[PDB]
């Protein structure tokens, strides 16, 4: 029989993932993301927009 890591089986699975399983899982993800979208939507230094410094080693201590 053909192994699970056979090249031919991978090619057939790749077509199945692209032509049958893909569209179905894409539609499922759209509905799920919409539900989570609904729940969620329900001076640089002084403002933090300028990302500054908060509060063993890699080099030899000179």
């Amino acid at each position: 029989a053909k192994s699970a890591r056979a090249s031919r089986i991978k090619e057939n699975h790749q077509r199945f993932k692209k032509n049958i399983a893909g569209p179905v899982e894409a539609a499922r993800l759209e509905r799920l993301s919409a539900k989570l979208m609904a729940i969620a939507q329900a001076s640089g230094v002084k403002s933090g927009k300028s990302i500054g410094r908060k509060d063993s080693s890699i080099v030899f201590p000179m």
């Binding site: 699975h13 199945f16 993932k17 049958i20 399983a21 893909g22 179905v24 899982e25 894409a26 499922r28 993800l29 759209e30 509905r31 799920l32 993301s33 539900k35 989570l36 979208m37 729940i39 969620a40 939507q41 329900a42 002084k46 403002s47 933090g48 927009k49 990302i51 500054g52 908060k54």
Partner: protein
């Protein structure tokens, strides 16, 4: 035995880690990946099979399903990781204001005798015009990180468990730009996320949990007998396991009051068995009906995550139609689905007349 599970030692943690989230590309919409639930037990269902090419096609099949109690999770934080030549590294994490007592219990070993001040100074960061500090961390994640995760914790006061210390985990945010998912995580702060939003019906998931322990066991039951490759005695059970390809059969709402009802049987009943789930209690929240068996004992924390790859079987993307859900008692040879059905069968009793 198998040498792929060779270090048969007790799991380092009781919770179990995902160890792999599905690969992320920015094209898909923003979504979560994993969730937590508590194992309630098992029950029997009848399914109207629609498997073209099978012997049981257009026939009724009896199957065993497991029930996981899933109260909504609360999103209380956000974590960002960066890519390094040494792997993924946590750059910074941004916690939300107003954490609950349960999630603070996770941070303490002796909560009763402690002066509960975890995140007391962190709360002042939000409300004392140090919001620049909070935004600076949020902007740091946006412009340096490639993977953003959400810290969500369970609500075990809703669960019929004597434990009061909730469970934390990081759930990856997949499908979007790093900027998009950061705004996603910040908007989810202090908010409950229900299970029907993370997963849904007739989809196939993976479950991660720690198996039931057995203690010191000999070669006969440990390695299955009729150096590192020679069977020996030691710990059997309490091993971290990742089981894949388990189909969700139903997601119950808990507030429906007819969770166990189908379009075939018109009986207003919930999922809890007559007398309650044995050694667990009553499921009063959202629940996920998973086909077959799943690692872990009852009332054990259960980690549910998505499939790492697009499925290659017709077992996925196939509709699940239910005919009847068992609710009879698991404490014995039960024969009644509802308290009314028992009283109707046996008539009225001596105590019934004496009380009335």
């Amino acid at each position: 035995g198998s040498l792929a599970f060779l270090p048969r030692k007790r799991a380092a943690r009781h919770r179990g880690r995902v160890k792999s989230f599905p690969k992320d590309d920015p094209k898909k919409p923003v979504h979560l990946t994993a969730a937590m639930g508590y194992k309630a037990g098992m029950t029997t269902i009848v399914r109207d099979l629609d498997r073209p090419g099978a012997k049981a096609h257009k026939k009724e099949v009896v199957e065993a399903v497991t029930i996981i109690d899933c109260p909504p999770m609360v999103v209380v934080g956000l974590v960002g990781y960066i890519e390094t030549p040494r792997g993924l590294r946590s750059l910074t994490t941004v916690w939300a204001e107003h954490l609950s007592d349960e999630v603070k219990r996770r941070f303490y070993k002796n909560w009763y005798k402690s002066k509960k001040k975890a995140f007391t100074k962190y709360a002042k960061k939000y409300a004392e015009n140090n919001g620049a500090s909070i935004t600076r961390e949020l902007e740091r994640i946006k412009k340096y990180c490639t993977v953003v995760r959400v810290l969500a914790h369970t609500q075990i006061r809703k669960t019929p468990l004597k434990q009061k210390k909730a469970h934390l985990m990081e759930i990856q945010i997949n499908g979007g730009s790093v900027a998009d998912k950061v705004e996603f995580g910040r908007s989810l702060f202090e908010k409950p996320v229900t299970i029907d939003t993370i997963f849904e019906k007739d989809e196939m998931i993976d479950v991660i949990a720690v198996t039931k322990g057995h203690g010191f066991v000999g070669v006969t039951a440990r390695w299955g007998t009729k150096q590192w490759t020679v069977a020996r005695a030691g710990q059997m059970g309490y091993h971290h396991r990742t089981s894949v390809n388990h189909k969700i059969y139903r997601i119950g709402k808990g507030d429906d009051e007819a969770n166990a009802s189908t379009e075939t049987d018109l009986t207003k009943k919930k999922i809890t068995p007559m007398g309650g789930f044995v050694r667990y209690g009553e499921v009063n929240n959202d629940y996920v009906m998973i086909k077959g068996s799943v690692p872990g004992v009852k009332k054990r924390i259960m980690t549910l995550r998505k499939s790492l790859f697009t499925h290659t079987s017709r077992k996925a993307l196939e509709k699940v139609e239910l005919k009847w859900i068992d609710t009879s008692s698991e404490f014995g040879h039960g024969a009644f689905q509802t308290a009314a059905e028992k009283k109707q069968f046996m008539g009225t009793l001596k105590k019934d007349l004496q009380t009335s």
